Design a protein around this ligand. Structure first.
Ligand code: ATP
Ligand code: MG
Ligand code: MG
Lengths: 357, 80, 208, 52, 49, 132, 101
């Protein structure tokens, strides 16, 4: 029947209203919030679902409700707390983290969202050296893409916040103290050479100014296990590089530390895209390692499990509510029972199996 | 060094430094006068957190053992 | 074969076994009682009672497989159906209520009706008589007619596609274009029929 | 990973106990140990007594 | 079984015994398959189940 | 056609023994092995030396008992002992066999440096398995 | 008498390589390293060359012990394929049978 179809949608578009009663219900994300809060960071297959269905709907779930609870009760005076979303493949860690990014975005926090951190430790076709420190390298294209997305998300706060120091980009170009933070971002996009340095200034400025009570800051890093792992980038000597040597990885490692206050850090682990990790590794120590685990502790691990019986039925009815499950036997009880066995209640496998059907 | 050791020793480790740094920032935000190192690491909250980290490092990491670590963090960080 | 000729092909129809005894024709009823004292072949790894298993689609997958790469061939077929479902959803959403009714969004029904549209009734077998190669009109069986439709599709996509396009994108665009009776595969079918009409008079030169 | 001082000094203490090469020796120089640890081909009973 | 058998066809082979008798979600199986490849190991389990 | 170790058909007048009648593919099926040592077992040494010693021991016994051997000899090695079991026709006088046994044993013990014993079973005439 | 003149020449190669095995070991050890001066290594490179050519153990060929056949030999029995088949097909090899499977 369609009894869970009533439970397959909720009218509370605002993430603050959501509570345990709303569990297993899909809340539509406003169109403006997609083109502002989420220009990046949504999984690639989910983005396909948003294009075909014509609407983004994120199931409310207990893991993401627990996280939103901690964020509401945040003690800004105390140091920032790192929340680590760890789970098996396809369980929804990225979309559980995106739910928190929507909650903070609506409360006027400053979103610092790193959609994927593995992209910065592999498949880099331009790797320059850094003037600030010659030992480090600069990834111009990777930094340039992030800045364009960071600008879109935080465009409102780019005029209020103002630099507290002077930054000399070139002999002929420098940033005077007091100028809006938008100038630092604008220079990075205009001059790709400085892009990897504009990012460092942005991270440094926001980290320092957040403690002044001007704004809240959400450091949302998905794929955080990339920072303290290994790379597949080679130097001019054809010798593999280390994560610290990269400028982008070096700056970000500071933001995920609890040495500041005035915001919250939300981290996610992803074996997908990871370098030199097993296919069946999902636990925090397996992916982070000894260096990554020690770097982030004390952190709060939030397990993202597979769909429970209530959530699986809600997900099944959502696909049926959009006419996605076009196979004649899918709507039947034997179809549903079959898909429950093949998918095994895994969110990703259910999406993949239903895509072909 | 710490890397050489086969059995984790929380005393004088990266964990103790990271924990002590957090507790020092937590007491400073409270506006209390700077506290002693032994005072911060003698509390029961820190005692339990030591036991959980050691279990993860030596006994083994699993969803059950990670759940115990989650509760210790909540008590240590005064989270609801 | 490692199966002696006394072995019987397995019947994997779930409803057939659970039907009431009276609902079964006595011919079918006889076979069940006979099969109780006979040997049955083990079911193949690709033979299941799943409600989503389509024999035609399973066959099309095997005709695309290369070197025993079934995972890749099944992936290409799964991606194709998805590529066709996503292409019809776009058109359905971007169409008026009147147009929306006609648009079909079931990929399994677009695949079967596409193949059927590419099946040739008659064929041409190439023969040599009098020192030249004279082909002659032939009537095609149900098995040869079905094979030809699938083979012509898997050959148009494999070869006559741009270098950077992928099979899930060329096959989807051909199943849908054939489903409307306008694709190149349909032209291949027209040519085979058209050639037979030209040679209809000279059907005599067949000995098989 | 690199070998710290504790790691390296333990390896030398082990090699000293187990009678293994204790210094850092190139692969080329390890053939001298093989030559003098293995019976040469010409000294094996199969070679010199191949024929009746 | 979703972890051990990442391939869809291998999981379907484990579904065939239960799905046939409409007994899905009514039994708990513990398997121990050693030897062969991915497809041969799923088939060995199917007969054992 | 295979010509190896096959006593080919005549016209029903050739008397073949049990050993001669059976072709190589019946080895280990209908007829056993004439020599039994441990040198061809898995992970065992000195196969080459045992095989060469057998070849000589077969040529030596033929020459030492010329025309007096009804069938191929059977060689049995246990520990360092060698045992030669031969079916011998009753052509020679009895005392001549005692000489050839004492001679052939002593000579073969000082040549291979092992204890060698000769076991002789005398038959009235060659045993015929079938006429081929 | 050995089977042929080729088996005799090989026998001498095997008896002179046994005589010069220690010598060619000690001298060649001085060259198979990177710890000694290259001047000494170049000089040992000439002492080894000066030894008689039949001392070199790479000039030994494994030949059938009974027919002196150069190729086709089986090292466990030291017999050519042709001679080994005669003994095997007759039940004269202990444990060797035809392979049917
Ligand atoms: N809360 C949710 N709402 C809607 N769909 C969801 C939700 N959680 C999971 N899914 C489905 O599961 C798919 C995979 O989710 P997601 O990529 O977020 O998981 P993940 O654990 O981060 O994956 P990976 O380990 O590959 O990084 C999504 O594309 C979507 O189809
Ligand atoms: Mg993810
Ligand atoms: Mg040679």
């Amino acid at each position: 029947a369609e009894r869970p179809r009533t439970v397959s949608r909720t009218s509370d578009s605002d993430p603050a209203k959501h509570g345990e009663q709303h569990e297993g219900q899909h809340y539509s994300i406003p169109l403006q919030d997609l083109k502002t809060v989420f220009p990046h960071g949504l999984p690639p297959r989910y983005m396909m679902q948003v294009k075909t269905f014509g609407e983004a709907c994120l199931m409310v779930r207990k893991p993401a409700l627990e996280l939103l609870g901690y964020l509401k009760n945040t003690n800004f005076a105390h140091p920032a707390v790192r929340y680590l979303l760890y789970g098996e493949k396809g369980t929804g860690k990225t979309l559980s983290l995106c739910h928190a990014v929507h909650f903070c975005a609506r409360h006027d926090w400053l979103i610092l969202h790193i959609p994927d951190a593995h992209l910065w430790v592999k498949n880099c076709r331009e790797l320059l050296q850094s003037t600030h420190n010659k030992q480090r390298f600069d990834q111009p294209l990777e930094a340039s893409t992030w800045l364009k997305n960071f600008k879109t998300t935080n465009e409102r706060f780019l005029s209020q916040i103002k630099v507290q120091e002077k930054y000399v980009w070139n002999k002929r170009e420098s940033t005077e103290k007091g100028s809006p933070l938008g100038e630092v971002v604008e220079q990075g996009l205009t001059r790709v050479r400085n892009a990897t340095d504009a990012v460092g200034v942005v991270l440094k400025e926001l980290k320092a100014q957040s403690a002044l009570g001007l704004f809240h800051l959400l450091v949302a890093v998905d794929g955080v296990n990339a920072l303290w792992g290994r790379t597949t980038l080679k130097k001019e000597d054809r010798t593999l590089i280390a994560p610290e040597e990269l400028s982008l990885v070096h700056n970000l490692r500071k933001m995920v530390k609890n040495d500041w206050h005035g915001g919250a850090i939300v981290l996610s682990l992803s074996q997908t895209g990871s370098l030199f990790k097993s296919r069946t590794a999902y636990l925090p120590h397996e992916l982070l390692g000894k260096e990554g685990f020690n770097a982030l502790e004390p952190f709060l691990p939030i397990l993202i499990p597979n769909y429970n019986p209530k959530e699986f039925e809600s997900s099944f009815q959502y696909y049926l509510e959009n006419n996605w499950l076009q196979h004649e036997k899918a709507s039947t009880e034997e179809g549903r029972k079959e898909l429950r066995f093949l998918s095994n209640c895994n969110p990703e496998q259910l999406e993949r199996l239903c895509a072909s059907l | 060094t710490e890397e050489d050791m086969d059995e984790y020793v929380w005393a004088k480790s990266s964990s103790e430094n990271s924990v002590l740094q957090t507790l020092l920032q937590m007491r400073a935000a409270e506006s209390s006068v700077a506290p002693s190192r032994e005072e911060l690491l003698g509390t029961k909250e820190v005692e339990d957190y030591q036991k959980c980290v050691v279990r993860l490092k030596n006994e083994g990491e699993n969803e059950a053992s990670l759940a115990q670590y989650k509760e210790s963090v909540k008590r240590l960080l005064n989270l609801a | 074969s490692r199966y002696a000729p006394e072995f019987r092909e397995p019947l994997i129809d779930k409803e057939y076994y659970r039907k009431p005894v009276a609902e079964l024709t006595e011919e079918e009823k006889y076979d069940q009682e006979l099969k109780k004292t006979q040997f049955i072949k083990a079911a193949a790894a690709t033979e299941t009672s799943s409600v989503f298993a389509d024999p035609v689609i399973s066959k099309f997958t095997n005709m695309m497989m290369k070197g025993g790469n079934k995972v890749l061939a099944r992936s290409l077929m799964a991606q194709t159906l998805e590529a066709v479902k996503r292409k019809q959803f776009e058109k359905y959403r971007a169409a008026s209520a009147e147009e929306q009714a006609t648009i079909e969004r079931n990929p399994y029904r677009i695949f079967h009706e596409a193949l059927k549209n590419c099946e040739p009734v008659i064929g041409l077998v190439p023969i040599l008589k009098g020192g030249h190669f004279y082909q002659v009109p032939v009537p095609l069986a149900d098995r040869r007619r079905r094979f030809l439709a699938m083979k012509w599709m898997i050959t148009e996509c494999r070869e006559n596609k741009p270098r950077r396009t992928l099979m899930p994108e060329k096959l989807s665009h051909e199943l849908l274009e054939a489903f409307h009776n306008r694709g190149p595969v349909i032209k291949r079918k027209h040519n085979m029929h058209k050639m037979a009409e030209a040679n209809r008079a000279l059907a005599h030169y067949r000995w098989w | 990973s690199p070998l710290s001082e504790y790691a390296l000094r333990m390896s030398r203490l082990s090699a000293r106990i187990f009678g293994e090469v204790a210094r850092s020796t190139d692969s080329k120089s390890m053939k001298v140990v093989s030559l003098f640890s293995e019976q040469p081909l010409a000294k094996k009973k199969e070679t010199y007594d191949w024929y009746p | 079984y979703l972890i051990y058998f990442p391939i869809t066809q291998d999981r379907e082979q484990l579904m065939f015994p239960f799905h046939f008798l409409d007994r899905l979600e009514r039994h708990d199986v513990t398997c121990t398959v050693s030897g062969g490849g991915r497809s041969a190991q799923a088939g060995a389990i199917r007969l054992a189940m | 056609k295979n010509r190896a170790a096959r006593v080919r058909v005549a016209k029903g007048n050739k008397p073949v023994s049990y050993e001669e009648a059976h072709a190589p593919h019946y080895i280990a099926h209908r007829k056993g092995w004439l020599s039994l040592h441990t040198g061809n077992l898995d992970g065992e040494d000195h196969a080459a030396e045992r095989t060469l010693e057998d070849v000589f021991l077969r040529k030596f016994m033929m020459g030492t008992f010329p025309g007096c051997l009804a069938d191929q000899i059977v060689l049995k090695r246990r520990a360092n002992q060698v045992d030669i079991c031969a079916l011998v026709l009753r052509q020679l006088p009895a005392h001549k066999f005692y000489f050839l046994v004492g001679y052939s044993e002593t000579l073969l013990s000082h040549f291979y440096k092992c204890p060698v014993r000769l076991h002789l079973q005398t038959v009235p005439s060659k045993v015929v398995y079938k006429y081929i | 008498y050995y089977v042929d003149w080729r088996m005799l020449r090989d026998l001498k190669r095997r008896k002179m390589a046994y005589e010069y095995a220690d010598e060619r070991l000690r001298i060649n050890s001085l060259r198979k390293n990177t710890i000694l001066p290259k001047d000494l290594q170049e000089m040992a490179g000439d002492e080894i060359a000066a030894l008689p050519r039949d001392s070199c153990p790479v000039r030994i060929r494994n030949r059938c012990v009974m027919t002196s056949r150069p190729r086709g030999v089986k090292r466990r029995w030291r017999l050519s394929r042709i001679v080994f088949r005669h003994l095997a097909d007759h039940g004269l090899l202990s444990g060797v049978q035809r392979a049917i499977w």
